From Swiss-Prot, chain D:
The chain holds residues 178 to 366 of 383 of the full protein. It comes from the Bacteria. This is Multidrug resistance protein MexA. Induction: By growth under severe iron limitation. Disulfide bonds: none annotated. Belongs to the membrane fusion protein (MFP) (TC 8.A.1) family. Changing residue 123 to A/D: Abolishes complex formation and thereby decreases drug resistance. It is found in: Cell inner membrane. In both X-ray crystal structures approximately the last 100 residues are not ordered. Disruption phenotype: Disruption of MexA, MexB and OprM significantly reduces active efflux of N-(3-oxododecanoyl) homoserine lactone/3-oxo-C12-HSL/PAI-1, but not N-butyryl homoserine lactone/C4-HSL/PAI-2. The periplasmic linker component of the MexAB-OprM efflux system that confers multidrug resistance. Functions as the major efflux pump for n-hexane and p-xylene efflux. Has been shown in one study to be involved in the active efflux of the autoinducer N-(3-oxododecanoyl) homoserine lactone, thereby playing an indirect role in quorum-sensing; but has been shown in another study not to be involved in efflux of this autoinducer. Over-expression of the pump increases antibiotic and solvent efflux capacities. Implicated in the secretion of the siderophore pyoverdine.
UniProtKB/Swiss-Prot annotation, chain E:
Belongs to the resistance-nodulation-cell division (RND) (TC 2.A.6) family. It is found in: Cell inner membrane. Disruption phenotype: Disruption of MexA, MexB and OprM significantly reduces active efflux of N-(3-oxododecanoyl) homoserine lactone/3-oxo-C12-HSL/PAI-1, but not N-butyryl homoserine lactone/C4-HSL/PAI-2. Induction: By growth under severe iron limitation. This is Multidrug resistance protein MexB. Pyridopyrimidine derivatives, such as ABI-PP, are not exported by the MexAB-OprM efflux pump, bind tightly to a MexB hydrophobic pocket and so potentiate the activities of antibiotics such as erythromycin. Component of the MexAB-OprM multidrug efflux complex, composed of six MexA subunits forming a hexameric tube, binding to a MexB trimer, which interact with the trimeric OprM outer membrane channel protein. OprM is thought to not directly contact MexB; instead, MexA joins MexB and OprM by forming a funnel-like hexamer anchored to the inner membrane. MexA may initially form a hexameric ring complex with MexB prior to OprM, then OprM undergoes a conformational change as it contacts MexA, allowing the periplasmic gate to open. It comes from Pseudomonas aeruginosa (strain ATCC 15692 / DSM 22644 / CIP 104116 / JCM 14847 / LMG 12228 / 1C / PRS 101 / PAO1).
UniProtKB/Swiss-Prot annotation, chain G:
The chain holds residues 178 to 332 of 383 of the full protein. This is Multidrug resistance protein MexA. It is found in: Cell inner membrane. The gene is mexA. Belongs to the membrane fusion protein (MFP) (TC 8.A.1) family. In both X-ray crystal structures approximately the last 100 residues are not ordered. The periplasmic linker component of the MexAB-OprM efflux system that confers multidrug resistance. Functions as the major efflux pump for n-hexane and p-xylene efflux. Has been shown in one study to be involved in the active efflux of the autoinducer N-(3-oxododecanoyl) homoserine lactone, thereby playing an indirect role in quorum-sensing; but has been shown in another study not to be involved in efflux of this autoinducer. Over-expression of the pump increases antibiotic and solvent efflux capacities. Implicated in the secretion of the siderophore pyoverdine. Disruption phenotype: Disruption of MexA, MexB and OprM significantly reduces active efflux of N-(3-oxododecanoyl) homoserine lactone/3-oxo-C12-HSL/PAI-1, but not N-butyryl homoserine lactone/C4-HSL/PAI-2. It comes from the Bacteria. Induction: By growth under severe iron limitation. Component of the MexAB-OprM multidrug efflux complex, composed of six MexA subunits forming a hexameric tube, binding to a MexB trimer, which interact with the trimeric OprM outer membrane channel protein. OprM is thought to not directly contact MexB; instead, MexA joins MexB and OprM by forming a funnel-like hexamer anchored to the inner membrane. MexA may initially form a hexameric ring complex with MexB prior to OprM, then OprM undergoes a conformational change as it contacts MexA, allowing the periplasmic gate to open. The lineage of its organism: Bacteria, Pseudomonadati, Pseudomonadota, Gammaproteobacteria, Pseudomonadales.
Length: 40, 51, 50, 189, 101, 50, 155
């Protein structure tokens, strides 16, 4: 006469606690060519 | 605001948000316990018992 | 520019209240803030910044 | 025409076999992290304290992983964010310099992390998270809990719930707080 | 005072309210405009940070309700807390209310 | 505030469409999610409430 | 490529085992403070005219205390504020250069001052504050008063 409940018992558990951060990539080694000499 | 290097601010960092009333001016209490209610005024040209 | 100046110099600001609800638990000061108000005489619209 | 020491570039020469990532965290989270380390609630990560997992522009996880280094001592003025530099290997040129990516650096471990399922947590009218708990003598009860973050598909509650306690997962449309019912284990373990 | 002594009258009573002290702050528009602060930014700052302005609406459980925006009950309380609110000028820095009001 | 929210959100309107009710006076009001600003962290990021 | 005395830097080599904390203060409040300290209403004495004991952005106190340096002699024309820097030691890199902090620099004391509660005083029609006072023969007379600063809930 009394309905039953589907139950999930929880116990202690360790976690890792990731966090999400935004930001854009940059290359390891960019070397823009600059002339250090004059002429055409 | 957010700079193009990826650093941003949120409303959680500036202000403390949360649900509450829209005017905390009037708040009744009935018989000691916390309560509230709606005071009903009658429409004119009409009786009171049917309303 | 003159129209946008006198749409901002004589505004009737809804300017709040000292100790408006909700307040800090245990302080009993209440006073109505009067902020800006719309100007009355000709010498008060005379002193409008542009 | 070209002169001695131009300001503009001429041809960008770059290599891509490692690729840096410049993620920024706010200083409020860094101060909260420094407060949680000195207290007895959170601990140092440990051996694997340096891995970072990358989430791409589309949302799919980048398969390789790398290390982070020098959480920088400087901080911006108009935004206030501490920059964090990570290094990623890249054998096949999938990452390009300029993508807006999301790194996932880990910090801390919890010893007693009481952890509730997702289908047993439902918001009330106020907006705070609450869950239904059965009592010791088999009767339901409502508790006001606080859900800080979600991990995977399970909430990480901090207060309210306790160790070894029980949360109703299936059969939520027949119970209100106060009716006495008996414990029955559910499907998803 | 003249009607409390008239014996033909009973329980004469004001239906209004006896009047309160009111804190009227003097915004100096001259020094506000001389430090670069625009004269509409100060009106918006005072109105939102003191008067709980109205912005838009949100849905919670099928019924539309509204959103208000007001400063915290700590930095709104007494006239020493007028000095806390800061207004950005046209240069980029922050200008306090107690410098010109 | 929660049982004032309940009457404004559920009891008020069927009690207002009914026969012979002209005007109400609700002692309290519903929810409205408020954004409590503070000028310390508003100075921290160089922001105005506008 | 680099050149002799270029515009942008290459690396910012900071050290931060002591720090400087530039602290702003508007010129009107400092002018009022100089007025009421040149008057006999208030005094600044003792060793506590140099402690600051700042607090961080989230309300967390800082456990060490610092020393208050010079005050800048000229205000800024874009904000109307002097700068008052201070020196704080952090032995284990507690705070980073460039944050936002609140200095709590102690102004001074007032020896033997009396505090009236907020329920007593009520303003008059001109703007003068006043408070009803019971005399020695238990008769209420009106007395004007000058209360301008609120501390706790007492003027």
């Amino acid at each position: 006469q009394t309905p039953e409940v589907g139950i999930v018992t929880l116990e202690a558990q360790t976690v890792t606690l990731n966090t999400e951060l935004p930001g854009r990539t940059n290359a390891f080694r960019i070397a823009e060519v600059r002339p250090q000499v004059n002429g055409i | 605001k957010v700079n193009p290097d990826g650093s941003q601010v949120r409303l959680k960092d500036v202000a403390d948000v949360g649900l509450g009333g829209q005017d905390y001016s009037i708040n009744a209490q009935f018989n000691g316990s916390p309560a509230s209610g709606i005071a009903i005024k009658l429409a004119t040209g009409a009786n009171a018992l049917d309303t | 520019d003159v129209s946008s100046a006198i749409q901002a110099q004589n505004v009737q600001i809804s300017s709040g209240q000292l100790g408006g609800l909700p307040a800090v638990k245990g302080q009993q000061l209440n006073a109505t803030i009067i902020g800006k108000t719309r100007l009355q005489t000709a010498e008060q619209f005379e002193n409008i910044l542009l | 025409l070209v002169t001695n020491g131009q300001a503009n570039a001429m041809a960008t020469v770059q290599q891509l076999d490692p690729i840096y990532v410049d993620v920024t965290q706010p200083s409020t989270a860094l101060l909260r992290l420094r407060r949680e380390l000195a207290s007895g609630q959170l601990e140092r990560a440990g051996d694997n304290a340096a891995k970072v997992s990358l989430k791409l522009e589309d949302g799919s996880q980048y398969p390789l992983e790398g290390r982070l280094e020098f959480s920088e001592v400087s901080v911006d003025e108009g935004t206030g964010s501490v920059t964090i530099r990570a290094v990623f290997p890249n054998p096949n040129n999938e990452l390009l310099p300029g993508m807006f990516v999301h790194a996932q650096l880990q910090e801390g471990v919890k010893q007693k992390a009481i952890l509730a399922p997702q289908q047993g947590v439902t918001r009330d009218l106020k907006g705070q998270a609450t869950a239904l708990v059965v009592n010791a003598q088999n009767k339901v009860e409502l508790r006001v809990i606080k859900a800080d973050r979600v991990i995977g598909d399970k909430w990480l509650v901090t207060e309210g719930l306790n160790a070894g306690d029980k949360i109703i997962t299936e059969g939520l449309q027949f119970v209100q707080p106060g009716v006495e019912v008996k414990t029955v284990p559910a499907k998803n373990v | 005072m003249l009607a409390a002594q008239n014996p033909a009258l009973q329980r004469v009573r004001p239906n209004g309210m006896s009047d309160e002290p009111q804190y009227k702050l003097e915004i100096d528009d001259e020094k506000a405009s001389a430090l670069g602060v625009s004269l509409a930014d100060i009106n918006s700052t005072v109105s939102i940070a003191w008067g709980s302005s109205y912005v838009n609406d949100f849905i919670d459980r099928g019924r539309v309700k509204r959103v208000y925006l007001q400063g915290r009950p700590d930095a709104r309380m007494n006239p020493d807390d007028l000095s806390k609110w800061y207004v950005r000028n046209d240069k980029g820095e922050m200008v306090p209310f107690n410098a010109f009001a | 505030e929660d049982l004032s929210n309940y009457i404004v959100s559920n009891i008020q309107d069927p009690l207002s469409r009914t026969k012979g009710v002209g005007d109400f006076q609700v002692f309290g009001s519903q929810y409205s999610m408020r954004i409590w600003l503070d000028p310390a962290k508003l100075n921290s990021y160089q922001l105005t409430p506008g």
